[PDB]
Enzyme design. Structure first.
Site, PDB file in Angstrom:
ATOM      1  N   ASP A 160      48.924  45.399  40.457  1.00 46.47           N
ATOM      2  CA  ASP A 160      48.992  46.811  40.791  1.00 46.47           C
ATOM      3  C   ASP A 160      49.786  46.951  42.088  1.00 46.47           C
ATOM      4  OD1 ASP A 160      47.285  46.066  42.860  1.00 46.47           O
ATOM      5  OD2 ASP A 160      45.719  47.478  42.331  1.00 46.47           O
ATOM      6  N   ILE A 187      34.990  50.327  32.912  1.00 48.80           N
ATOM      7  CA  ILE A 187      33.886  49.761  32.141  1.00 48.80           C
ATOM      8  C   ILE A 187      33.510  48.429  32.782  1.00 48.80           C
ATOM      9  CG2 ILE A 187      33.059  48.928  29.911  1.00 48.80           C
ATOM     10  CD1 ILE A 187      34.965  50.687  28.491  1.00 48.80           C
ATOM     11  N   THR A 232      34.783  45.101  29.098  1.00 48.56           N
ATOM     12  CA  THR A 232      35.017  45.125  30.544  1.00 48.56           C
ATOM     13  C   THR A 232      36.492  45.019  30.906  1.00 48.56           C
ATOM     14  OG1 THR A 232      34.846  42.738  30.956  1.00 48.56           O
ATOM     15  CG2 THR A 232      32.776  43.998  30.884  1.00 48.56           C
ATOM     16  N   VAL A 292      38.604  47.180  30.008  1.00 48.94           N
ATOM     17  CA  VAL A 292      38.995  48.566  30.254  1.00 48.94           C
ATOM     18  C   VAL A 292      38.608  48.937  31.679  1.00 48.94           C
ATOM     19  CG1 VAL A 292      38.840  50.946  29.422  1.00 48.94           C
ATOM     20  CG2 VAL A 292      38.525  49.044  27.826  1.00 48.94           C
ATOM     21  N   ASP A 319      49.224  48.251  46.012  1.00 48.19           N
ATOM     22  CA  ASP A 319      48.274  48.629  47.053  1.00 48.19           C
ATOM     23  C   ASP A 319      49.046  49.147  48.255  1.00 48.19           C
ATOM     24  OD1 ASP A 319      45.937  47.584  45.616  1.00 48.19           O
ATOM     25  OD2 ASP A 319      47.004  45.670  45.857  1.00 48.19           O
ATOM     26  N   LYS A 360      30.861  19.572  34.224  1.00 52.33           N
ATOM     27  CA  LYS A 360      31.694  20.356  33.322  1.00 52.33           C
ATOM     28  C   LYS A 360      33.120  19.844  33.319  1.00 52.33           C
ATOM     29  CE  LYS A 360      28.977  24.601  33.099  1.00 52.33           C
ATOM     30  NZ  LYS A 360      27.643  24.033  33.511  1.00 52.33           N
TER      31      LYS A 360
HETATM   32  C1  LIG Z   1      39.209  43.204  44.634  1.00 48.93           C
HETATM   33  C2  LIG Z   1      39.093  43.020  46.145  1.00 48.93           C
HETATM   34  C3  LIG Z   1      40.172  43.259  46.969  1.00 48.93           C
HETATM   35  N1  LIG Z   1      40.056  43.088  48.267  1.00 48.93           N
HETATM   36  C4  LIG Z   1      41.226  43.312  49.114  1.00 48.93           C
HETATM   37  C5  LIG Z   1      41.952  42.241  49.124  1.00 48.93           C
HETATM   38  C6  LIG Z   1      43.059  42.456  48.085  1.00 48.93           C
HETATM   39  O1  LIG Z   1      44.177  41.681  48.343  1.00 48.93           O
HETATM   40  C7  LIG Z   1      43.314  43.960  48.263  1.00 48.93           C
HETATM   41  C8  LIG Z   1      43.934  44.586  46.966  1.00 48.93           C
HETATM   42  O2  LIG Z   1      43.020  44.469  45.917  1.00 48.93           O
HETATM   43  P1  LIG Z   1      43.663  43.940  44.495  1.00 48.93           P
HETATM   44  O3  LIG Z   1      42.565  43.813  43.463  1.00 48.93           O
HETATM   45  O4  LIG Z   1      44.810  44.848  44.082  1.00 48.93           O
HETATM   46  O5  LIG Z   1      44.159  42.417  44.782  1.00 48.93           O
HETATM   47  P2  LIG Z   1      45.651  41.772  44.848  1.00 48.93           P
HETATM   48  O6  LIG Z   1      45.539  40.674  45.888  1.00 48.93           O
HETATM   49  O7  LIG Z   1      46.711  42.776  45.205  1.00 48.93           O
HETATM   50  C9  LIG Z   1      46.010  40.945  43.218  1.00 48.93           C
HETATM   51  F1  LIG Z   1      46.630  39.733  43.413  1.00 48.93           F
HETATM   52 CL1  LIG Z   1      44.492  40.657  42.344  1.00 48.93          CL
HETATM   53  P3  LIG Z   1      47.086  42.030  42.175  1.00 48.93           P
HETATM   54  O8  LIG Z   1      48.503  41.759  42.586  1.00 48.93           O
HETATM   55  O9  LIG Z   1      46.800  41.722  40.716  1.00 48.93           O
HETATM   56  O10 LIG Z   1      46.699  43.458  42.391  1.00 48.93           O
HETATM   57  O11 LIG Z   1      42.142  44.460  48.494  1.00 48.93           O
HETATM   58  C10 LIG Z   1      38.908  42.686  48.794  1.00 48.93           C
HETATM   59  O12 LIG Z   1      38.837  42.529  49.967  1.00 48.93           O
HETATM   60  N2  LIG Z   1      37.840  42.451  48.054  1.00 48.93           N
HETATM   61  C11 LIG Z   1      37.914  42.604  46.745  1.00 48.93           C
HETATM   62  O13 LIG Z   1      36.813  42.363  45.942  1.00 48.93           O
HETATM   63 MG   LIG Z   2      46.904  44.520  44.121  1.00 50.47          MG
HETATM   64 NA    NA Z   3      36.570  46.982  33.512  1.00 44.22          NA
HETATM   65 NA    NA Z   4      44.474  47.321  43.995  1.00 42.38          NA
END
Ligand SMILES: Cc1cn([C@H]2C[C@H](O)[C@@H](COP(=O)(O)OP(=O)(O)[C@@](F)(Cl)P(=O)(O)O)O2)c(=O)[nH]c1=O
Ligand SMILES: [Mg+2]
Ligand code: NA
Ligand code: NA
Ligand code: NA
EC number: 2.7.7.7
Length: 326
Positions: free
Chosen positions: A181, A97, A92, A94, A183, A63
């Site tokens: 977001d 969803i 998806t 949303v 956390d 690819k």
């Molecule tokens: C989605 C996900 C999160 N986690 C842990 C690790 C992520 O860093 C933490 C927060 O989830 P987020 O989906 O908010 O990830 P993020 O690292 O904060 C991010 F970079 Cl995707 P964003 O800044 O967009 O929220 O939960 C997992 O262990 N497994 C997962 O499948």
């Molecule tokens: Mg996050």
């Molecule tokens: Na979704």
């Molecule tokens: Na999160």
DNA sequence: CCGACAGCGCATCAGC
DNA sequence: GCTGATGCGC
DNA sequence: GTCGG
């Protein structure tokens, strides 16, 4: 992003396999390949060169050759023209969803933003709030807003009980200049792996944040995990800030380091690190690291005094949060 | 070849 | 109501 | 889709 075209292609393939094909292992394979290519410090010149990385195999190498020769992938050009795949992929986006509901809606003739808007009674509560803030939830959060949000959350938690500790994790803790977001990891001395001396520990904090109009909506809520919506306050005549996703996770205080390792991520880093633990004969979750016996059964939790202790057990040199963005 | 692929909280539904 | 499977999203 | 044994 030396290789942004390739990693974009792989991410789009991952999303197709997850959302349309419902092939979760192909989805994880493509994200793994994108991750390892994203950190590779050279502009890839051939699929052969990319196949040397772990997680790029024969199919992805071919690819990449097609993408390098022509700037595109016929497989993806066809997916983009397919109405069913495009409709399912869009739905998806949303919150609430997923692939299954997206296909159910599309099978019902519910395919667009307005179809959702006109069929709000077919949505569960999460999906209804997801639709309400569809635009806002597309917007990234600049780190400067993340710092204002942290100050609010920390100060309001301190007002409920000065013994709470709130830690902003996710991409913010990894130093990112913008986050998707917020956390929040929460601890309190009343809640340990030994006992819960205080009820409503999470509810009390959520309630305070609703009281001051920071939390505006709830996506789901239990005794240890809150997922919802928040908004910074704006000034006079100022346009309002976008509404933001917020996740709060109440973890037993003596399990903070496993919890902060988990909540700091990234998800792919967590997957890599937990896989490595398994190879070393351990299992890691957000609470504990435990040895695996000869039968595969998880043993008793091991002493953990720092994030680094978890790395030491699995024989990994310590990696600062800023270096975990895989 | 092929078994495994990280781990889990909360919402929802089905079968009883 | 409980219990277990599935969806979804960290 | 990829890989270790
Ligand atoms: C989605 C996900 C999160 N986690 C842990 C690790 C992520 O860093 C933490 C927060 O989830 P987020 O989906 O908010 O990830 P993020 O690292 O904060 C991010 F970079 Cl995707 P964003 O800044 O967009 O929220 O939960 C997992 O262990 N497994 C997962 O499948
Ligand atoms: Mg996050
Ligand atoms: Na979704
Ligand atoms: Na999160
Ligand atoms: Na490879």
């Amino acid at each position: 992003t030396l290789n942004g075209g390739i990693t974009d292609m792989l991410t789009e393939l991952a999303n197709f396999e997850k959302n349309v094909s419902q092939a979760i292992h192909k989805y994880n394979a493509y994200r793994k390949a994108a991750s390892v290519i994203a950190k590779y410090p050279h502009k890839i010149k051939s699929g052969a060169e990319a196949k040397k990385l772990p997680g790029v195999g024969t199919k992805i190498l071919e690819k990449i050759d097609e993408f390098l020769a022509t700037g595109k992938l016929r497989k993806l050009e066809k997916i983009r023209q397919d109405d069913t795949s495009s409709s399912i992929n869009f739905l998806t986006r949303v919150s609430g969803i997923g692939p299954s509901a997206a296909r159910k809606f599309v099978d019902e003739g519910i395919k667009t933003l307005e179809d959702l808007r006109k069929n709000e009674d077919k949505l569960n509560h999460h999906q209804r709030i997801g639709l309400k803030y569809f635009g806002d939830f597309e917007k990234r959060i600049p780190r400067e807003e993340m710092l204002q949000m942290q100050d609010i959350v920390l100060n309001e938690v301190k007002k409920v009980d000065s013994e709470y500790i709130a830690t902003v994790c996710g991409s913010f803790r990894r130093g990112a200049e913008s986050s998707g977001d917020m956390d929040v990891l929460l601890t309190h001395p009343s809640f340990t792996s030994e006992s819960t001396k205080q009820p409503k520990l999470l509810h009390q904090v959520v309630e305070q944040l609703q009281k001051v109009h920071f939390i505006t909506d709830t996506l789901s809520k239990g005794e240890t995990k809150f997922m919802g919506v928040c908004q910074l306050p704006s000034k006079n005549d100022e346009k309002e800030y976008p509404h933001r996703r917020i996740d709060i996770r109440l973890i037993p205080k003596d399990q903070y380091y496993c919890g902060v390792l988990y909540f700091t991520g990234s998800d792919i880093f967590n997957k890599n690190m937990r896989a490595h633990a398994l190879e070393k004969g351990f299992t890691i979750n957000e609470y504990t690291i435990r040895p695996l016996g000869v039968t595969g059964v998880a043993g008793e939790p091991l002493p953990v005094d720092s994030e680094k202790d978890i790395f030491d057990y699995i024989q990994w040199k310590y990696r600062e949060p800023k270096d975990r963005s895989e």
